[PDB]
């Protein structure tokens, strides 16, 4: 029963988020040495790639058992509130420590300075620190999918019409992750609570992400893409 839930969540994450193994990297060299307020160019690709991964997050949510049984209002509410969490967790899972870079789903591989100029700004060091904090957890697709599924199906989100049903769906996910951690890494004693503590870091960063969006609007040349604008605020 719990093995099928783990298999379902892992499958859903693999189908909507390709591993770093399959992606061919490419690198840009502009805006890579000096920090600017915003490199218009990197922002154009960055916003386009985030819009596409937001779409992948909804596909991923629709494959999680029980999510489609919630009202559409609550699904929208959960997705808007977890959007930045899952995006940041995804890009931090694609961090290459030796290069100090992050790779997007199309293969775009940016260093720290380029991440800043693309739109991260003062969030840059926060995100790169979190990506380093994930390294000792040795996370695979199942653990990354389960973490995303737990952040998304959170019964404590505001405006939830049925918080109780959402909490009912989150409990099997948490015990699935606990069981999975016990079987994968029997050496690490307290790996399960430390993974949950990483969700606390992630929710802190993405709360500061919702703040960066406000200042990004006045700096970009135009206005935010439609889907991003709907998800945030």
């Amino acid at each position: 029963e719990v093995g099928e839930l783990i298999e379902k969540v892992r499958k859903a994450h693999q189908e909507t988020f390709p591993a770093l193994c399959q992606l061919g990297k490419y690198t840009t060299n502009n805006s890579s040495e000096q920090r600017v307020s915003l490199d218009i160019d990197l922002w154009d690709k960055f916003s386009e790639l985030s819009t596409k991964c937001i779409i992948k997050t909804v596909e991923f949510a629709k494959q999680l058992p029980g999510f489609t049984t919630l009202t559409i209002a609550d699904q929208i509410t959960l997705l808007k509130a977890a959007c930045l969490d899952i995006l940041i967790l995804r890009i931090c899972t694609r961090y290459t420590p030796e290069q100090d870079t992050m790779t997007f789903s199309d293969g775009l591989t940016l260093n720290r300075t380029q991440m800043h100029n693309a739109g991260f700004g003062p969030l840059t060091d926060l995100v790169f620190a979190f990506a380093n904090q994930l390294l000792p957890l040795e996370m695979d697709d199942a653990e990354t999918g389960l973490l995303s599924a737990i952040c998304l199906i959170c019964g404590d989100r505001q405006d939830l019409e049925q918080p109780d049903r959402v909490d009912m769906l989150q409990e099997p996910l948490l015990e699935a992750l606990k069981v999975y951690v016990r079987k994968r890494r029997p050496s690490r004693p307290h790996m399960f609570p430390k993974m949950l503590m990483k969700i606390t870091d992630l929710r802190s960063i993405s709360a500061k992400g919702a703040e960066r969006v406000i200042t990004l609007k006045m700096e970009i040349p135009g206005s935010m893409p439609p889907l991003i604008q709907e998800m945030l605020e």
Partner: peptide, 26 residues
């Protein structure tokens, strides 16, 4: 909301998806 909605009520289809992606992009 608007776009978000259709993504959730997606008789899903690469054509539908392509349309929503362009709308999502702008």
């Amino acid at each position: 909301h608007k776009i978000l909605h259709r993504l959730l009520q997606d008789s899903s289809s690469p054509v539908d998806l392509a349309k929503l992606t362009a709308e999502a992009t702008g």
